[PDB]
Design an enzyme around this catalytic site. Structure first.
Site, PDB file in Angstrom:
ATOM      1  N   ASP A  32      -8.917  -4.995   5.301  1.00 31.92           N
ATOM      2  CA  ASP A  32      -8.943  -3.532   5.401  1.00 31.92           C
ATOM      3  C   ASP A  32      -9.506  -3.127   6.676  1.00 31.92           C
ATOM      4  O   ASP A  32     -10.562  -3.485   7.305  1.00 31.92           O
ATOM      5  CB  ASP A  32      -9.809  -3.077   4.368  1.00 31.92           C
ATOM      6  CG  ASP A  32      -9.940  -1.248   4.365  1.00 31.92           C
ATOM      7  OD1 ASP A  32     -10.731  -1.050   5.024  1.00 31.92           O
ATOM      8  OD2 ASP A  32      -9.149  -0.936   3.457  1.00 31.92           O
ATOM      9  N   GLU A  53       0.740  -9.181   3.913  1.00 30.73           N
ATOM     10  CA  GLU A  53       0.854 -10.545   3.370  1.00 30.73           C
ATOM     11  C   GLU A  53      -0.102 -10.446   2.107  1.00 30.73           C
ATOM     12  O   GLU A  53      -1.047 -10.001   2.100  1.00 30.73           O
ATOM     13  CB  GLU A  53      -0.469 -11.220   4.364  1.00 30.73           C
ATOM     14  CG  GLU A  53      -0.489 -12.570   4.079  1.00 30.73           C
ATOM     15  CD  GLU A  53      -1.387 -13.645   5.070  1.00 30.73           C
ATOM     16  OE1 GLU A  53      -1.819 -12.703   5.960  1.00 30.73           O
ATOM     17  OE2 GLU A  53      -1.724 -14.497   4.866  1.00 30.73           O
ATOM     18  N   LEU A  54       0.770 -11.192   0.877  1.00 30.61           N
ATOM     19  CA  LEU A  54       0.031 -11.160  -0.249  1.00 30.61           C
ATOM     20  C   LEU A  54      -1.134 -12.030  -0.486  1.00 30.61           C
ATOM     21  O   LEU A  54      -0.806 -13.403  -0.115  1.00 30.61           O
ATOM     22  CB  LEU A  54       1.005 -11.099  -1.483  1.00 30.61           C
ATOM     23  CG  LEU A  54       0.779 -11.585  -2.835  1.00 30.61           C
ATOM     24  CD1 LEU A  54      -0.145 -10.145  -3.315  1.00 30.61           C
ATOM     25  CD2 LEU A  54       1.528 -11.665  -3.810  1.00 30.61           C
ATOM     26  N   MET A  55      -2.231 -11.794  -0.639  1.00 31.36           N
ATOM     27  CA  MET A  55      -3.614 -12.801  -0.707  1.00 31.36           C
ATOM     28  C   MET A  55      -3.727 -12.837  -2.148  1.00 31.36           C
ATOM     29  O   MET A  55      -4.612 -12.023  -2.746  1.00 31.36           O
ATOM     30  CB  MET A  55      -4.467 -12.241  -0.027  1.00 31.36           C
ATOM     31  CG  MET A  55      -4.484 -11.739   1.497  1.00 31.36           C
ATOM     32  SD  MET A  55      -4.257 -13.045   2.274  1.00 31.36           S
ATOM     33  CE  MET A  55      -2.538 -14.052   1.847  1.00 31.36           C
ATOM     34  N   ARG A  86     -16.270  -6.603   0.358  1.00 32.55           N
ATOM     35  CA  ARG A  86     -15.023  -5.798  -0.282  1.00 32.55           C
ATOM     36  C   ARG A  86     -13.783  -5.571   0.422  1.00 32.55           C
ATOM     37  O   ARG A  86     -12.816  -5.280   0.211  1.00 32.55           O
ATOM     38  CB  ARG A  86     -15.604  -4.271  -0.765  1.00 32.55           C
ATOM     39  CG  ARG A  86     -15.924  -3.653   0.547  1.00 32.55           C
ATOM     40  CD  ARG A  86     -16.492  -2.149   0.234  1.00 32.55           C
ATOM     41  NE  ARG A  86     -17.336  -1.578   1.409  1.00 32.55           N
ATOM     42  CZ  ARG A  86     -18.453  -1.796   1.777  1.00 32.55           C
ATOM     43  NH1 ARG A  86     -19.008  -2.750   0.986  1.00 32.55           N
ATOM     44  NH2 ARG A  86     -18.890  -1.515   2.819  1.00 32.55           N
ATOM     45  N   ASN A  87     -13.910  -5.747   1.812  1.00 28.51           N
ATOM     46  CA  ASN A  87     -12.948  -5.837   2.959  1.00 28.51           C
ATOM     47  C   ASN A  87     -12.363  -6.893   3.261  1.00 28.51           C
ATOM     48  O   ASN A  87     -11.417  -7.056   4.210  1.00 28.51           O
ATOM     49  CB  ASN A  87     -13.312  -4.795   3.908  1.00 28.51           C
ATOM     50  CG  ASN A  87     -13.715  -3.459   3.845  1.00 28.51           C
ATOM     51  OD1 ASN A  87     -13.022  -2.686   3.011  1.00 28.51           O
ATOM     52  ND2 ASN A  87     -14.778  -2.773   4.177  1.00 28.51           N
ATOM     53  N   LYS A 115       0.889  -1.053   0.228  1.00 25.66           N
ATOM     54  CA  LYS A 115       0.111  -0.193  -0.097  1.00 25.66           C
ATOM     55  C   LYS A 115       0.861   1.202  -0.209  1.00 25.66           C
ATOM     56  O   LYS A 115       1.860   1.357   0.693  1.00 25.66           O
ATOM     57  CB  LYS A 115      -0.898   0.002   1.002  1.00 25.66           C
ATOM     58  CG  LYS A 115      -2.055  -0.820   1.211  1.00 25.66           C
ATOM     59  CD  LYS A 115      -2.930  -0.614   2.440  1.00 25.66           C
ATOM     60  CE  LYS A 115      -3.912   0.469   1.807  1.00 25.66           C
ATOM     61  NZ  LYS A 115      -5.079   0.652   2.521  1.00 25.66           N
ATOM     62  N   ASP A 117     -16.834  -1.968   9.580  1.00 26.24           N
ATOM     63  CA  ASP A 117     -17.387  -2.058   8.118  1.00 26.24           C
ATOM     64  C   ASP A 117     -17.099  -3.742   7.783  1.00 26.24           C
ATOM     65  O   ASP A 117     -16.244  -3.758   6.789  1.00 26.24           O
ATOM     66  CB  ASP A 117     -16.521  -1.147   7.293  1.00 26.24           C
ATOM     67  CG  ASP A 117     -16.891  -1.061   5.868  1.00 26.24           C
ATOM     68  OD1 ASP A 117     -18.081  -1.398   5.542  1.00 26.24           O
ATOM     69  OD2 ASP A 117     -15.969  -0.272   5.226  1.00 26.24           O
TER      70      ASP A 117
HETATM   71  C1  LIG Z   1      -4.836  -3.376   0.437  1.00 27.95           C
HETATM   72  C2  LIG Z   1      -5.072  -4.709  -0.282  1.00 27.95           C
HETATM   73  O1  LIG Z   1      -4.416  -5.687   0.323  1.00 27.95           O
HETATM   74  C3  LIG Z   1      -4.352  -6.802  -0.458  1.00 27.95           C
HETATM   75  N1  LIG Z   1      -4.898  -6.532  -1.729  1.00 27.95           N
HETATM   76  C4  LIG Z   1      -4.637  -7.892  -2.439  1.00 27.95           C
HETATM   77  C5  LIG Z   1      -3.706  -9.084  -1.994  1.00 27.95           C
HETATM   78  N2  LIG Z   1      -3.311  -8.864  -0.711  1.00 27.95           N
HETATM   79  C6  LIG Z   1      -3.641  -7.669   0.003  1.00 27.95           C
HETATM   80  N3  LIG Z   1      -2.750  -7.827   1.185  1.00 27.95           N
HETATM   81  C7  LIG Z   1      -5.151  -8.038  -3.902  1.00 27.95           C
HETATM   82  C8  LIG Z   1      -6.453  -7.432  -4.489  1.00 27.95           C
HETATM   83  N4  LIG Z   1      -6.766  -7.869  -5.565  1.00 27.95           N
HETATM   84  C9  LIG Z   1      -5.778  -8.699  -5.897  1.00 27.95           C
HETATM   85  C10 LIG Z   1      -5.427  -9.285  -7.187  1.00 27.95           C
HETATM   86  C11 LIG Z   1      -4.456 -10.308  -7.277  1.00 27.95           C
HETATM   87  C12 LIG Z   1      -3.696 -10.330  -6.240  1.00 27.95           C
HETATM   88  C13 LIG Z   1      -2.410 -11.284  -6.510  1.00 27.95           C
HETATM   89  N5  LIG Z   1      -1.300 -11.997  -6.343  1.00 27.95           N
HETATM   90  C14 LIG Z   1      -3.597  -9.627  -5.007  1.00 27.95           C
HETATM   91  N6  LIG Z   1      -4.990  -8.800  -4.887  1.00 27.95           N
HETATM   92  C15 LIG Z   1      -7.489  -6.636  -3.505  1.00 27.95           C
HETATM   93  N7  LIG Z   1      -7.041  -5.167  -3.743  1.00 27.95           N
HETATM   94  C16 LIG Z   1      -6.481  -4.517  -4.936  1.00 27.95           C
HETATM   95  C17 LIG Z   1      -6.926  -4.159  -2.632  1.00 27.95           C
HETATM   96  O2  LIG Z   1      -6.695  -2.973  -2.662  1.00 27.95           O
HETATM   97  C18 LIG Z   1      -7.305  -4.493  -1.125  1.00 27.95           C
HETATM   98  C19 LIG Z   1      -8.786  -4.609  -1.239  1.00 27.95           C
HETATM   99  C20 LIG Z   1      -9.380  -5.394   0.081  1.00 27.95           C
HETATM  100  C21 LIG Z   1      -8.617  -5.101   1.052  1.00 27.95           C
HETATM  101  F1  LIG Z   1      -9.082  -5.884   2.371  1.00 27.95           F
HETATM  102  C22 LIG Z   1      -7.111  -5.208   1.057  1.00 27.95           C
HETATM  103  C23 LIG Z   1      -6.641  -4.683  -0.106  1.00 27.95           C
END
Ligand SMILES: C[C@H]1Oc2nc(cnc2N)-c2c(nc3ccc(C#N)cn23)CN(C)C(=O)c2ccc(F)cc21
Length: 292
Positions: A167, A94-96, A150-151, A47, A146
């Site tokens: 989030d 953490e990459l999700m 979406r979170n 972020k 919240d």
């Molecule tokens: C801050 C951001 O954090 C993350 N996003 C992704 C994966 N891991 C996260 N730690 C994540 C999101 N979309 C994708 C697509 C592919 C891959 C891969 N590989 C990862 N992501 C969601 N997103 C863009 C967001 O901002 C988003 C939306 C909701 C939320 F709770 C957190 C986040």
């Protein structure tokens, strides 16, 4: 520098784990501020704080970092660290790989091409995962404010996926905006009326999340505006069951949406009910709709 208190323990920016900027590489964008996939090899989501921001945006960013770093639970996204000593500032999560839950549900809906893309058990596992995260917040007296699809995030697209709360922006704002931005469709009557928030606030929102999950990613209260939902809910109105939703699952939703907060279940009870649903063959053998 602002302090942060969680579970009776105080933390400061000094407590955040600063990762040297040279150790971090951006790979691609993912989606105020941007989010990137990155490497530190450890894979992360990054972020960013816009360099063009107010001092309040700065404090907001710092506080978000403190909040996530202080949590310790398997269903809340981990913070690997921060990079606040170089610009633009980074928070490392953490990459999700599964992305956010709302987008996942919409994209992974069963279809003639992908007829068995998702089953009732997949949805119940997601529900349990987030309820476990919510229970952890509840027992630590943290109100999320919240809870919504979406979170939430998923570890991977595939079967072994784990869902986590990802989030905490609303809670951060309240810890320290406008009517049109409030998540009204996720809020209980006492919340948007008297501005009273308790653990039972999150129970109501979880009910709406459950509806989101079993609708496979529809926007709540179809065809209703924020004010229309406000008047609907305040008058006792509740959503119908999602398409093909098992009665036992809908019943959890309707308990989460009890008008009196004292009448709504805590998350221990919600988890117990989700567990019993997962055991019931009539629930888990129910086919989800196939979208043509
Ligand atoms: C801050 C951001 O954090 C993350 N996003 C992704 C994966 N891991 C996260 N730690 C994540 C999101 N979309 C994708 C697509 C592919 C891959 C891969 N590989 C990862 N992501 C969601 N997103 C863009 C967001 O901002 C988003 C939306 C909701 C939320 F709770 C957190 C986040």
């Amino acid at each position: 520098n602002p302090n942060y208190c969680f579970a009776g323990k105080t933390s400061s920016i000094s407590d955040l784990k600063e990762v040297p900027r040279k150790n971090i590489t951006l790979i691609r964008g993912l989606g105020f501020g941007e989010v990137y996939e990155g490497q530190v090899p450890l894979q992360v989501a990054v972020k960013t704080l816009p360099e063009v921001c107010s001092e309040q945006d700065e404090l907001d960013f710092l506080m978000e970092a403190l909040i996530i770093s202080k949590f310790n639970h398997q269903n809340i996204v981990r913070c690997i660290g921060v990079s606040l000593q170089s610009l633009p500032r980074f928070i490392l999560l953490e990459l999700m790989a599964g992305g956010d839950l709302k987008s996942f549900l919409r994209e992974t809906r069963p279809r003639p091409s992908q007829p068995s893309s998702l089953a009732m058990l997949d949805l119940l596992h997601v529900a349990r995962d987030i309820a476990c995260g919510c229970q952890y917040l509840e027992e630590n007296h943290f109100i999320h404010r919240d809870i919504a699809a979406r979170n939430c995030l998923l570890t991977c697209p595939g079967p072994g996926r784990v869902a986590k709360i990802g989030d905490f922006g609303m809670a951060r704002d309240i810890y320290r905006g406008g009517c049109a931005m409030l998540p009204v469709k996720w809020m209980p009557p006492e919340a948007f009326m008297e501005g009273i928030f308790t653990s039972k606030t999150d129970t109501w929102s979880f009910g709406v999340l459950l509806w989101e999950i079993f609708s496979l990613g529809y926007m709540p209260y179809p065809s209703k505006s924020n004010q229309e939902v406000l008047e609907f809910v305040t008058s006792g109105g509740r959503m119908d069951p999602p398409k093909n939703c098992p009665g036992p699952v809908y019943r959890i939703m309707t308990q989460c949406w009890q008008h009196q907060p004292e009448d709504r279940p805590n998350f221990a009870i919600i988890l117990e009910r989700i567990e019993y649903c997962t055991q019931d063959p009539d629930v888990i053998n129910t086919a989800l709709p196939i979208e043509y």
